[PDB]
Write a protein that binds this ligand. Structure first.
Ligand SMILES: Nc1ncnc2c1ncn2[C@@H]1O[C@H](COP(=O)(O)OP(=O)(O)O)[C@@H](O)[C@H]1O
Ligand SMILES: Nc1ncnc2c1ncn2[C@@H]1O[C@H](COP(=O)(O)OP(=O)(O)O)[C@@H](O)[C@H]1O
Ligand code: BEF
Ligand code: BEF
Ligand SMILES: [Mg+2]
Ligand SMILES: [Mg+2]
Lengths: 140, 50, 417, 417
């Protein structure tokens, strides 16, 4: 449940080397990958776990283009009269809600992608904090 | 009724039809285009021969 | 249907409308619940909705269009709009928007806007080409807001006396310094009535913050225009919410070249609210007040200015003194000289139970030759010189008698010559 | 049998009734346990029960009908009702319901309602068609609640003095500002007696919050009607429970077009209770008080209003000052000007041991021309002008002598002419 999400966001070792915002961004990516692996069709989703006030809620991104391949993530650039879009690009929907984020394969892919994201963020931060000293002699 | 009467119809003529919201439209677009084809095409050989 | 025609009607009208719609017994739900049910029943027949709401944004990205029924709070009648519309039509908080809306669709629970029609009573063309508020250049007031009605009834005194005590101009920064139970309520009622009669073009705005519901209803049935209010049935959250809503509405209006005149009462309660909501920054001074907590009231009093090309934002806020709260004392101290107009009411004269009770020597306006003409200014100088040596109760009785034998200010002027 | 006839009788009556029922020695159990056993014995003969209880709902969905014996708390005598009945008959908290009930059946442990008979002393027809409380429109009081008894005994002074100090109206928002050990207990006793004698139609209500049992029993045997109380034998939970129960009961009554007059004492203890129960929101101000914890007392003081078509809800709450608790100070500060009626009692006059001890210059009523007639208002003005220059002890002795030579207020009026 979301109490487990709070426990894992407050139980990190590098608490500020990976802020809560980026924690939940990586967790949203995890849940999106899990929901992608759930359905046989490919459909991009956003989570918005509601860091402090509430739980998560999956969505359904359209990636508005004039193509039709896998129409789960296809919609024309002019479909804006019904379903209340009034849009040209960026039309995304919020159709599917309340996916499962605690089963076996979901937990596995979440752990894997969280490890990947934390190692990437730590490396990027430890390199960027020294990038300001470019063109200098450093020990080590 | 026939599938050929639906493949020659862009989705613009679906969301305007009543009782075609999110679940119905999503189910249609999933179970129609997953078979290789898509929704909305231009052809003239229809219906042979009925 | 339109939402405003469900807005202006009382509860019994909604009852009979729901009975027309063949609805269940609806006397138990909120007015907004009844409006929601009636709109759903109307759209079930295949109908669209027309709505109007002031826009508000949180950090969540999307916007909410609130109505004045709940004094701009969350409710089943407010409209939900996506951040895409805010990005496209260049929307922001306080921008009142009217247009086509639909009931919540499958899985939704609040209304959604379809097509914008009036952005602050303006087409989106010039609404997108809006000058920024803080990017403007403040000025001073030459347009004199005449407080005299001309009818000369029994209470009009309290208005006409200002015509010789504190001149009012468009965009003036005015503050009232008064003890409780002195007559400020009827005073602001009078000022609202007078500005609406003499200047009906400028949109009227009155701020009822941290007040009793009886005053709320008495002022919502006496002001000559749309009003907002806020009682103490909710904590300081509602107070700060309505303060931001009204300040952004006034900012968007004056950016649309409008003349806004806000009447705030009382400002000490707004300061208490802003203190209660804002967490302590680790430093507190005497009075149990945080240092930078008064930043929001400061800003709210600083929003008053005079636009160069057109429009103005006048703010007339009342402050509470002599309450015994040293906190309040310090608050007034912070508001010592931040405004260029002071209206000083004293409990000593009000205890003699004559109204109004003006502190002529203590009240005044800075840089007042730019407001009125030269002869009026010279006569104001003459009246000030005549009223300075005498006290306050005798001076008040003198002014009351002089403005009681006469009706318009020219008679008193020539009588003072 | 009826439950109320087991309600109004003391413990010895229940003892002899159980002895009539051939029951075991029952002197050891609670009164409610005795009532439960007697009702079970009566229904074992094939009998139905008649009960009456104020309704309360939790988030659990189902409702409980409490009696006034435990001041509306859980007990073996309260009735359990399913959410189905609340959904059908449009029930809500505070709605007192009387009707047929049965003892708990096989596996049950509390009573269950069979058929509703009186919903707030009304048929379910108009009870389901009840106007909402917050949807009403507040007003001000013209119906003057005469505090004078007319008998003119030794203590009636404390009532008649109010007839010249603080006028009372239906739906008035009144608050007492008084130090401890000054005479508020007998004051509210007097006010209750006077309103019951002069206006027996309006249902009387008195709030005893955080008090001693001796005062509880003395007030439950002197008020001229049903009363509620709450001592400190339980934590703030019981206090907030009885506060919600009484406020919803008054709301349902005034929705049924009733005239409710609640007397609360003391309000600082209610504030302490609401502070103790409500968790900290992460921000505390001076005095160890949470910011939005006072929201519930605020609301409770804001419930007072005047209904347009009929009925009113007057609230007269006492506050404690001069106790040395700075917390209490801040509390009173929050209650500076929230009410339109102030009754100021001072310890300085009470130390001279004359009763009552009225702060005439500090007490008063806002917008009082709408309460009484014109001549009475002019005489009130004359009395205020006569009492302003003099002090407080001399003024109190003067008023006592003037109302001691005379009995009705007309004599003092003409004597002041
Ligand atoms: N212009 C006036 N004419 C007659 N009575 C007045 C006037 N102004 C104030 N009053 C008196 O003031 C009282 C109400 O004052 P109130 O509105 O409570 O003052 P405040 O709003 O400062 O607390 C009324 O009883 C009314 O008689
Ligand atoms: N009007 C009065 N007539 C007679 N005795 C009074 C009157 N007012 C106060 N007293 C006496 O003063 C005492 C008041 O104490 P108490 O009522 O406990 O304090 P508080 O006024 O704070 O409730 C009582 O013992 C009562 O006998
Ligand atoms: F109207 Be009072 F000054 F609270
Ligand atoms: F009853 Be006293 F005021 F403690
Ligand atoms: Mg007032
Ligand atoms: Mg007492």
């Amino acid at each position: 449940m979301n109490k487990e999400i709070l426990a894992v966001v407050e139980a990190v070792s590098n608490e500020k080397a990976l802020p809560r915002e980026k924690i939940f961004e990586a967790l949203e990516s995890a849940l999106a990958t899990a929901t992608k692996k759930k359905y046989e069709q490919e459909i991009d989703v956003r989570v918005q776990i509601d860091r402090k006030s509430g739980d998560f809620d999956t969505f359904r991104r359209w990636l508005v283009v004039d193509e039709v391949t896998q129409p789960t993530k296809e919609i024309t650039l002019e479909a804006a009269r019904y379903e209340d879009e009034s849009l040209n690009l960026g039309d995304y929907v919020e159709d599917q809600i309340e996916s499962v984020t605690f089963d076996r394969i979901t937990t596995q892919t979440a752990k894997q992608v969280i490890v990947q994201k934390v190692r990437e963020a730590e490396r990027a931060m430890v390199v960027d904090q020294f990038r300001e000293h470019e063109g200098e002699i450093i020990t080590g | 009724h026939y599938i050929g009467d639906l493949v020659q119809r862009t989705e613009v003529e679906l969301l305007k039809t009543p009782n075609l919201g999110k679940k119905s439209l999503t189910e249609i677009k999933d179970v129609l285009a997953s078979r290789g084809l898509s929704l909305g095409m231009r052809l003239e050989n229809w219906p042979p021969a009925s | 249907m339109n939402l405003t025609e469900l807005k202006n009607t009382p509860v019994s009208e909604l009852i009979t409308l729901g009975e027309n719609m063949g609805l269940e017994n609806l006397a138990r739900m909120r007015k907004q619940d009844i409006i929601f049910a009636i709109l759903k029943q109307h759209a079930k027949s295949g109908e669209d909705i027309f709505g109007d709401g002031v826009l508000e944004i949180l950090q969540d990205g999307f916007g909410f269009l609130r109505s004045a029924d709940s004094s701009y709070l969350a409710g089943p009648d407010d409209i939900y709009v996506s951040p895409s519309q805010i990005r496209r039509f260049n929307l922001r908080t306080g921008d009142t928007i009217s247009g086509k809306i639909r009931p919540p669709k499958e899985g939704e629970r609040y209304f959604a806007l379809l097509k914008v029609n009036e952005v602050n009573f303006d087409k989106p063309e010039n609404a997108r080409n809006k000058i920024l508020f803080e990017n403007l250049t403040p000025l001073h007031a030459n347009s004199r807001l005449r407080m005299e009605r001309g009818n000369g009834s029994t209470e009009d005194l309290t208005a006409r006396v200002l015509d010789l005590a504190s001149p009012i101009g468009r965009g003036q920064r005015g503050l009232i310094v008064a003890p409780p139970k002195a007559g400020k309520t009827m005073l602001l009622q009078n000022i609202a009535q007078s500005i609406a009669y003499n200047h009906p073009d400028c949109v009227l705005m009155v701020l009822l913050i941290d007040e009793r519901p009886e005053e709320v209803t008495e002022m919502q049935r006496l002001v000559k225009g749309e009003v907002v209010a806020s009682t103490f049935d909710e904590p300081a959250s509602r107070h700060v919410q309505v303060a931001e809503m009204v300040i952004e509405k006034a900012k968007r209006l004056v950016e649309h070249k409008k003349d806004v005149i806000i009447l705030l009462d009382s400002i000490t309660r707004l300061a208490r609210a802003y203190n209660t909501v804002v967490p302590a920054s680790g430093k507190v001074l005497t009075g149990g007040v945080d240092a930078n907590a008064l930043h929001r009231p400061k800003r709210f009093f600083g929003a008053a200015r005079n636009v160069e090309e057109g429009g103005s934002l006048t703010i007339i806020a009342t402050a509470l003194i002599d309450t015994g709260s040293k906190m309040d004392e310090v608050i007034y101290e912070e508001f010592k000289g931040t405004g260029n107009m002071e209206l000083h009411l004293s409990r000593k004269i009000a205890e003699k139970r004559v109204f109004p009770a003006i502190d002529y020597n203590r009240s005044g306006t800075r840089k007042e030759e730019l407001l009125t003409t030269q002869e009026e200014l010279q006569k104001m100088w003459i009246l000030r010189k005549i009223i300075h040596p005498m006290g306050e109760i005798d001076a008040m009785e003198f002014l009351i008698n002089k403005l009681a034998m006469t009706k318009t200010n020219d008679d008193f002027f020539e009588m003072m010559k």
